[PDB]
């Protein structure tokens, strides 16, 4: 997939295309890759092959609706469930989560990562392509975080063969 998240002017956007790839064929091309969590309080975009990509999503929910939607705490509470003696399996996927306050990237291996100063996050095969266009724009244009996510996603769909121009974008507030 390509999942990217930009944050500019009290705006937090999170977009992603909609191509479910199986081998080098395309099985579904509309798929919603960015979903809403905690009654609409947090944004989550996933990447990494359905199954794991999903069970990682669920596990972060059972942690938000058990910590009052405190993103950062929910994140770490989840991460710690991997860094123990008795591991929590291992997930072939990663998430980009963000609410009005913070934005993160959580891997099903048990680690939480905070963005770099510019506050831009991308994941998936088309990842860095979007992240390159994003930084390009954020640092040289006035465009809103939505316009940028929109623009960056397309740039990435035209280079990644596992990313299409059929995307779903969500923003906060």
């Amino acid at each position: 997939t390509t999942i990217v998240s930009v944050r500019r002017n009290g705006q937090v956007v999170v977009g992603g295309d909609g191509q479910v790839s199986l081998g080098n064929t395309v099985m579904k091309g509309n798929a919603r890759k960015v979903r809403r969590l905690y009654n609409g309080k947090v944004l989550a975009g996933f990447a990494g092959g359905t199954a794991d990509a999903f069970t990682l999503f669920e596990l972060f929910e059972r942690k938000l609706e058990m910590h009052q939607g405190h993103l950062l705490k929910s994140a770490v509470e989840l991460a710690k469930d991997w860094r123990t003696d008795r591991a929590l399996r291992k997930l072939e996927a990663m998430l980009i989560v963000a609410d009005e306050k913070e934005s993160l990237i959580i891997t099903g291996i048990g680690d939480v990562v905070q963005p770099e100063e510019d506050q831009i996050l991308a994941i998936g095969s088309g990842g860095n392509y979007a992240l390159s266009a994003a930084r390009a724009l954020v640092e040289n244009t006035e465009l809103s975080a939505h316009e940028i996510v929109e623009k960056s996603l397309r740039i990435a769909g035209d280079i990644c063969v596992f990313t299409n121009t059929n995307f779903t974008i969500e923003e906060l507030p």
């Binding site: 479910v20 579904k28 798929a31 919603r32 890759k33 359905t50 999903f54 999503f57 669920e58």
Partner: protein, 111 residues
């Protein structure tokens, strides 16, 4: 066999101490009379059935949870309305509970 729409209509009255009677009496002690019209018994049997085919099929016990939502408005302020014959018909039952469509299953966990 399972209980159909019609079977839920009968279980609501014919049986001794049916819900129609139990509420007619438990509300008569408050000094209030209540009429359970027939066109309104259908909309309670074929409204508790609609819920058993869109959630767990708890059976007849579904009627209890439905009635308790219907006799919710009355059961509270029944004492403060002594000596009144309230007509519970299709118009009352309809706008007594509301509507109950499936959860959200899909849009939540399916790609």
């Amino acid at each position: 066999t399972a209980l159909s729409a019609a079977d839920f209509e009968r279980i609501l009255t014919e049986p001794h101490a049916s819900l129609t009677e139990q509420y007619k009496a438990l509300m008569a002690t408050e000094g209030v009379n209540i009429a359970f019209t027939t066109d309104a018994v259908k909309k309670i049997a074929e409204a508790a059935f609609r819920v058993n085919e869109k959630t767990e099929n708890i059976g007849a016990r579904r009627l209890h949870t439905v009635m308790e939502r219907l006799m919710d408005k009355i059961s509270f302020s029944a004492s403060d309305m002594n000596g009144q014959t309230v007509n519970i018909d299709a118009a009352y039952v309809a706008d007594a509970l509301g509507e109950v469509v499936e959860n959200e299953d899909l849009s939540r966990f399916i790609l």
